Amino acid sequence: AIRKKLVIVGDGACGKTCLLIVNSKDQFPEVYVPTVFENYVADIEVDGKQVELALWDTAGQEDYDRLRPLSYPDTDVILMCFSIDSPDSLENIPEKWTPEVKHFCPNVPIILVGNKKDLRNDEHTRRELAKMKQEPVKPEEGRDMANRIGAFGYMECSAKTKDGVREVFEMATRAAL
Amino acid sequence: KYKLCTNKEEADAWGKKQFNKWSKEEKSAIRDYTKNARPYNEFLRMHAGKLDSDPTMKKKIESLDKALNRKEAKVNDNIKVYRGDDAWIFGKEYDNSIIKNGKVDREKFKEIQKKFQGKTTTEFGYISTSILIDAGYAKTRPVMTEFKVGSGTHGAYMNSDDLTAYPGQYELLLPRNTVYKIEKIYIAIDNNTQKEQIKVEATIK
């Protein structure tokens, strides 16, 4: 079996911890949500290869900017996330996340992930984001962004509903090889 | 007096001094736990150390116990080690909101302290820890525990692929059924940030 490492970064509350959980338990968490998810190796096979992918969760807040780097060494792929319900997070992709990664994981393949895809057509979101002259990010924006930052690919998903989740990981896995 | 590692250099140097020649099976058992620890600990706690229900784990546990039981498998000095836990460690009645806006609910905290402070406990599950504080989950969780480990305790130190699926945690793994005493439970503020965190000091007995 092949051993690979995946690290997930992104702004706080953009949905990172939930994504991994749902990836390994087929269960969106509702009452006991860990800030940072535990060690879990995901078993995946794509294009005929069985891979064991260790997943490292991280804290994206500034408070933890000092600690994050201890998770970066020898990474095979990165999941850079933002939330579809938050345009603020997407902007941080270029602003904060891409610069940090290139610095610590210069050649590591990046996969840009739009989380909370279920909030794209959510009235509350829409309206709520309305109060700021912003609306949910459009798919075209993410792809555009991925192209801008040199990502291997771009994906959307919803942990809450599990849409595309399985897809994000498979892709991540391909890029890892 | 127990050693506390300041940085990776110290962490690394202390690490070289430890035992690393486990048997292949020994290495495999340790690495397997690190891949996912939910399976070992959750089961043992649920079953109180009786391994009869799931043979498939029996070998799995019985097997790790040995790696950890070898005579060469102990720690030379008295080292302080650290661990991070979610609020539910203190019972299903609690969650991470216990800390909101960098504040620990005092009413909630005090109940926990009366309940657990000074308590001596036996843990069915293995206890993962880190010699480096910044490594591990100690800063990213609500309750940070510093374990004072007496010399001669039996453990495995892992910071390489052979040993763990997550190199870079500067891990020290203690055996199941280890018993410890909680000396103090308190709230402390983080340097440079304003968030409180629940801090536990416990000693290995």
Ligand SMILES: NC(=O)C1=CN([C@@H]2O[C@H](COP(=O)(O)OP(=O)(O)OC[C@H]3O[C@@H](n4cnc5c(N)ncnc54)[C@H](O)[C@@H]3O)[C@@H](O)[C@H]2O)C=CC1
């Ligand atoms: N805790 C840390 O900072 C360190 C973690 N690790 C790694 O993490 C894994 C073990 O730590 P966790 O991720 O916390 O898994 P764990 O088995 O220690 O616990 C997982 C979840 O259960 C909770 N829990 C732990 N012990 C409990 C108990 N006695 N009663 C009720 N709830 C309990 C924890 O708070 C956590 O939310 C190992 O795979 C190890 O390699 C390694 C070194 C240090």
Ligand SMILES: Nc1nc2c(ncn2[C@@H]2O[C@H](COP(=O)(O)OP(=O)(O)O)[C@@H](O)[C@H]2O)c(=O)[nH]1
């Ligand atoms: N609607 C919706 N909410 C989500 C989804 N994933 C996570 N959340 C919520 O968004 C918040 C942040 O999630 P979390 O995974 O802790 O974010 P992290 O800090 O980036 O790990 C939590 O309150 C979740 O309830 C999703 O796919 N859809």
Ligand SMILES: [Mg+2]
């Ligand atoms: Mg999180």
